[PDB]
Structure 1
Amino acid sequence: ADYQTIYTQIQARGPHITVSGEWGDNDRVGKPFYSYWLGKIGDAQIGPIYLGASGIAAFAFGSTAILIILFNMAAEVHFDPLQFFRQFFWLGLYPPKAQYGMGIPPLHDGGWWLMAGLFMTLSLGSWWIRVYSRARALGLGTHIAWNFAAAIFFVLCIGCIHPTLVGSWSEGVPFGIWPHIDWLTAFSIRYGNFYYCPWHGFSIGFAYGCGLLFAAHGATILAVARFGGDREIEQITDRGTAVERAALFWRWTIGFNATIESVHRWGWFFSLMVMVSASVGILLTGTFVDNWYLWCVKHGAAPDYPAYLPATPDPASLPGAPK
């Protein structure tokens, strides 16, 4: 077996490299240090970190959002520190419970939620600028930023775009561990079972495919690490036996194959499509479809099944039944 694919047997140390960027080389703070146990399964060097304007703006806005959330959470346990740790998972900051439409809600019923939403959104935009500009500063393409953009766009969809399209802030995602989980069922119940939303299906198809692709790609590179397949950039520009064997393994298995470069386009595309499909689904939901199951029945797609115990009429529609 190739033990190098499991962990680094003999680690190496050397002077720390610094690639210069078009700006901000002085905003790298911290002194690098080395972790021997990290170095078994990764690169041993931790830090320094770049510390630009957008990154600080992100930390500023983020912490503001975190603080607004934590304070409202603590209010929910009347500031008892012990119950706060006990009940942490169950605590939350909720959008309005009452229907104000799109009017700004009272602070006690969703205003603080809206506030925390604003500052998180600013934090996401600020970090996006960091992710984008750091690439151009180092003379790299902006591929990560465009993937990250789709992920931010999906959050905005469930956070505020879908609420504004249907016209009620009551539909946003709460802040908190269990409560953001509870939203998923409330939403799916409201809109007629999300299994029958084709864009749920698409998103899941791509999410599962990301698991398929990264398991397959990761396994492939490790299987050709003896020929240096991990040095992917120079295998793109000068095809070595590593990527020839990787390409032929797949070709002989499934009948076709990618290149060392194109496999990353596949992976990038699949990842992006998780978020793009999710967003189309949310954008259609509530605006143009009210019950995804009935929409599938309307178009003849839903499965049906025999009764097992007897079919049961809606009692509310029998004559003389109470309301």
Structure 2
Amino acid sequence: EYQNIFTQVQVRGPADLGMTEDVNLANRSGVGPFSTLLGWFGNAQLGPIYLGSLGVLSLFSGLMWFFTIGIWFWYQAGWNPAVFLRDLFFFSLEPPAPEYGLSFAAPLKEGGLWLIASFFMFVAVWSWWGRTYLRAQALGMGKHTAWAFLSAIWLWMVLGFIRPILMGSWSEAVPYGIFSHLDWTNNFSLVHGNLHYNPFHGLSIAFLYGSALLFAMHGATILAVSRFGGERELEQIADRGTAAERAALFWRWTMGFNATMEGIHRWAIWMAVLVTLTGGIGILLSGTVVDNWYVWGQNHG
């Protein structure tokens, strides 16, 4: 049988320029090339892209963040390209040492560069957030994407900003390095008495695992009913077809209850969003309220 994991016959046509709605068409790029390689798995069309003020601002600060880290890595490499390549995963831009508290007066080589990099990252992410709101509004859509993005932003905000502020020093924040931020993560668990025993960490794991469970279930389900047009989910919401009915009956007969075509996407959005929402709470409470999760756990069983 055919499994519909890869397209059998690609078809190509004139590039789709998109819905207009209230989009300022001046800020839309031209259309890029089609990708036959991408066309085996999904759509082949590249672009156009919308680039307005927030997009340009986000890309700019974004690159500045990147360049600040990169220049520091070249400095740590004594400007030697071979030492650069050899030690790329080991370089790290660290926050100011605990002595500088929340002061912005740390010398560049001593954490000043970290604050400058973090400023750029902060502008890039928040202007990108505004962009996901405005791109939806210009098309008349709900704001679910911007809201879901706030949950990811929440954990990032807690890690780099809110928790270090509530702790009293930038030194509690996460360094910019491949291996060094892994070491940070492992040290964080040791210092706080084993994050496995932080109940919000356990919840976060349930939702992370549950996200893979749910997308496997839903991706497989839609593919299983694509022989009835099941992936055309919007029209199946408006006018239920046999794809939606078989999809629902598979799960009712299997586990005794089921979703609707619209409702499974509410299950999906909450499953994913709860990962970083509970995660952020669990990190926020570590060191501010609870110093040792295992010992706290022992008196709350």
Q: Distance in 1 between matches of 2:209 and 2:99?
A: 37
1:86-130 CA distances to partner (integer Å, 9 max, x unpaired)? 110001100123432222233222111111111101100111111
Residue number in structure 1 paired with 2:189: 188
Q: Distance in 2 between matches of 1:75 and 1:272?
A: 39
The question of whether the paired residues in 1 share the 8 Å contact of 2:38 and 2:44 is answered with yes
6-15 or 159-168: bigger deviation: 6-15
Cα distance, 1:198 vs structure 2: 0.6
The question of whether the paired residues in 1 share the 8 Å contact of 2:93 and 2:177 is answered with yes
Q: Secondary structure at the match of 1:46?
A: coil
Q: Distance in 2 between matches of 1:159 and 1:283?
A: 11
Q: Distance in 2 between matches of 1:82 and 1:190?
A: 36
Cα distance, 1:270 vs structure 2: 0.7
Residue number in structure 1 paired with 2:15: 16
Cα distance, 1:13 vs structure 2: 1.7
286-295 or 240-249: bigger deviation: 286-295
Residue number in structure 2 paired with 1:118: 119
The question of whether the paired residues in 1 share the 8 Å contact of 2:98 and 2:170 is answered with no
Q: Secondary structure at the match of 1:72?
A: helix
218-227 or 100-109: bigger deviation: 100-109
CA-based RMSD of the aligned residues comes to 1.1
**What percentage of residue pairs aligned between the two structures are identical?**
49
Name the aligned partner's letter for residue 297 of structure 1.
Q
Residue number in structure 1 paired with 2:270: 269
Name the aligned partner's letter for residue 173 of structure 1.
V
Name the aligned partner's letter for residue 19 of structure 2.
V
Provide closer, same or farther for how the CA distance between residues 53 and 288 of structure 1 changes in structure 2, counting only shifts above 3 A.
same
Q: Secondary structure at the match of 1:219?
A: helix
Residue number in structure 1 paired with 2:56: 56
1:100-249 maps to which residues of 2 (within 5 A)? 100-104=100-104, 105-249=106-250
Q: Secondary structure at the match of 1:92?
A: coil
Segments of 5+ residues of structure 2 without an aligned counterpart are none
Matching of residue 6 in structure 1 with residue 5 in structure 2: yes
Provide closer, same or farther for how the CA distance between residues 292 and 210 of structure 1 changes in structure 2, counting only shifts above 3 A.
same
1:222-261 CA distances to partner (integer Å, 9 max, x unpaired)? 0000000010000001000001000000000000001011
Question: TM-score, normalised to structure 2's length?
Answer: 0.97
Q: Distance in 1 between matches of 2:291 and 2:113?
A: 29
1:61-76 maps to which residues of 2 (within 5 A)? 61-76=61-76
Question: TM-score, normalised to structure 1's length?
Answer: 0.90
Q: Secondary structure at the match of 1:90?
A: coil
Matching of residue 42 in structure 1 with residue 71 in structure 2: no
The question of whether the paired residues in 1 share the 8 Å contact of 2:97 and 2:170 is answered with no
98-107 or 17-26: bigger deviation: 98-107
Q: Secondary structure at the match of 1:61?
A: helix
Cα distance, 1:9 vs structure 2: 1.3
1:60-99 maps to which residues of 2 (within 5 A)? 60-99=60-99
20-29 or 78-87: bigger deviation: 20-29
Q: Secondary structure at the match of 1:12?
A: strand
Aligned residues: 299
Cα distance, 1:176 vs structure 2: 1.2
Q: Distance in 2 between matches of 1:82 and 1:201?
A: 42
1:229-308 maps to which residues of 2 (within 5 A)? 229-299=230-300, 301=301
The question of whether the paired residues in 1 share the 8 Å contact of 2:204 and 2:278 is answered with yes
Residue number in structure 2 paired with 1:304: none
Q: Distance in 1 between matches of 2:163 and 2:229?
A: 48
Cα distance, 1:52 vs structure 2: 1.1
Structure of greater Rg:
1
The question of whether the paired residues in 1 share the 8 Å contact of 2:15 and 2:31 is answered with no
